[PDB]
């Protein structure tokens, strides 16, 4: 009665070792259950010689890719290996082989997630990758900045600090670089706005800046403004183009998003159409993506014998900026120049100045259609810097 | 070359359905080579207007002309009640027909029954709802603000420093609230949707009337501001805590700790938050509209279409307390030392001014309210809310 699902697994870190594991501990409820006995038939790994426990060694290991893409009788291949070369290619392969593919390869964009998808429904099997009408997405996309930035809002720490902290901790890496210049969020601002919009964007499309240029005093001064600094990763969606960002962003205390601390997460998501929508979570964990990756292949031995989107223009049945501008070497009094900006800027809904240290000041200005920033520049200001404003 | 539906009602919902499915149908055809056909579309009035606005679909007045036609594939269902809506559906899931309904009255008890007389007939049942789509485990406890309403006025009592009456009648002039507002403001409609958020997160049927329930409508300015002081809005909260085989369920006000995600949501948004473990989850926005149901309606019925028709193993409670006590005699210093002495042991204890010779406490770590305890002790006890998310 029962058939063999025969897979193979792309690569043995801790998802993978996860996803053996999971399987083991399920195998006979899946077996009794689903009437479907998964043997994990080969797990790629980089070297096969390596002492590993005991429970890895009753698998068939092997160095040669090409061992497991010639081998007809596997059903699903599972990549957790990372890389975009030559993994990618290897997914390919396997795809044009008739094989289903499960990934849950941080490293893939939406470049490579479109590709694979259509060569996937093009060769009539799944691509589950684990990594409408939205207009916009604004997003807390990475644990270690946002956890960095509560700690310098709480405990009134610097940036090195909170960092070193941050470090201690075990919620930053020894190199923390992808974290807190922006990188992973933007990866991941590359996904939402294929999810979110079914556009492709690529990774150097993301405008993008960091928190390591973000101080005390910006948080303080944006906090007695009435807002929290956040990195937020965002996509608008507006006339067929997707403006894509990363950077630090004050976010105004009364929305749901300026609530969002530590090493939590957050996507908030603005659509025609229906009322705002947020979902708050964790970064997920090898455990998790692991448990996900089961799942996906369980759902796909159900696949066993589209992209599609429902259009709603039933819907008959019925996009300004904000900026936090920092300037040095000021030349006079707050109310001088509070008085030059609003003879300067074009025009906006509101403006607000604030002390920031010594000759500095800093205005929050709303609903403008621009960067006020060369213009400030032009009238012989030096500014420090721009933080876009979001929330109401 | 074929899926031959019916529609019980035609509110917004089920006009939003037809709808989408007009707008969809030659892509499903062409693409999943179904052609979808609306044969029968039940009314309780088919001389009432309406969107549509006329249309070509055959309207009909008695259900048995749907529940008798064999042709039918799928039933679905957007017309509300329990009686005797849930009775159609028992006879369609009878008669071999999947049934998608997105019922917002069903409570767990309906959804069981139908659930296992589905699975009983090899068919598939659909049950779409709600908001903050309810799915759309290893959960030990959820939170949430599941009445817009509710959570209006209360916003509007905190932000605005109204009154309760007032703040309501704004909410009735604003839409927000109906002629009648008992549903929301007693907190029935948000207990209704702990008994469902229990059966999905629990699998676990509950009675509506287990749901331990207390509206807004006693809920003051002084609480909201002595609160505030103390750290804390108050909200609504629908809660349901799994527990030893057991489920509590309530619905009553609450401080929450203003750090706490909850605390944030205001006015109209509802939100559900999630703990099991794991870190904690939630889900916020408004009440899911009649379009988003819609689509929900028109997705599982491609997918009951398409497939023409059991958790892993990754195996590898004290309470808090608002008490507001009046005829005090004395200062506040002698009333925190008396509760110090009378109360069980406890983790912490901070009291407040609350308004002439009343005080209110906050009182974390007891195992049951203390209510009856400072009562027996001679103390005039107000009201007694829960307190959540200390720490």
Not at 82 to 110: C, Q, Y
Not at 154 to 162: C, L, N, S, V
Not at 356 to 380: C, F, M, R
Request: proline residues 2%.
């Amino acid at each position: 009665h029962m058939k063999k699902l025969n897979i193979a697994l792309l690569g043995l870190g801790t998802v993978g070792s996860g996803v053996v594991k999971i399987i083991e501990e399920n195998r006979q409820q899946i077996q009794d259950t689903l009437n479907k006995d998964i043997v994990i038939k080969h797990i790629l790994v980089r070297d096969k010689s390596k002492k590993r426990p005991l429970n890895i060694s009753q698998y068939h290991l092997t160095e040669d890719v090409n061992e497991i893409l010639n081998d007809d009788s596997l059903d699903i291949i599972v990549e957790v290996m990372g890389g975009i070369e030559p993994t990618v290619d290897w997914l390919r392969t396997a795809l044009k082989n008739k094989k289903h593919v499960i990934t849950a390869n941080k490293d893939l964009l939406a470049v490579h997630l479109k590709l694979l998808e259509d060569l996937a429904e093009e060769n009539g099997v799944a691509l589950k990758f684990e990594a409408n009408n939205i207009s916009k997405f604004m997003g807390i996309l990475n644990g270690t900045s946002n956890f960095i930035l509560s700690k310098m809002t709480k405990e009134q720490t610097t940036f090195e600090e909170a960092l070193d902290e941050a470090k201690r901790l075990g919620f930053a890496e020894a190199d923390p670089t992808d974290d807190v210049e922006g990188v992973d969020a933007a990866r991941k601002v590359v996904i939402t706005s294929y999810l979110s919009f079914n556009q492709v964007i690529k990774l150097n499309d993301v405008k993008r800046r960091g928190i390591s240029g973000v101080t005390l005093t910006d948080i303080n001064v944006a906090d007695q403004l009435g807002y929290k600094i956040k990195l937020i990763g965002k996509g608008i969606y507006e006339n067929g183009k997707v403006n894509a960002s990363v950077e630090p962003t004050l976010i105004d205390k009364k929305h749901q998003l300026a609530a969002v601390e530590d090493e939590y997460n957050a996507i908030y998501v603005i659509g025609d159409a229906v009322g705002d929508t947020m979902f708050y979570g964790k970064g997920a964990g090898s455990l998790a993506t692991g448990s996900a990756v089961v799942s996906d292949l369980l759902n796909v031995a159900l696949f066993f014998e589209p992209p599609h989107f429902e259009l709603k223009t039933d819907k008959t049945r019925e996009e300004k900026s904000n900026f936090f501008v920092v300037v040095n070497h000021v030349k006079g009094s707050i109310e001088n120049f509070e008085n030059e900006l609003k003879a300067i800027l074009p025009f906006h809904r509101s403006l607000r100045v604030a002390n920031y240290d010594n000759q500095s000041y800093a205005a929050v200005i709303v609903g403008l259609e621009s960067s006020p920033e060369e213009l400030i520049t032009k009238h012989g200001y030096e500014v420090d810097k721009v933080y876009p404003v979001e929330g109401v």
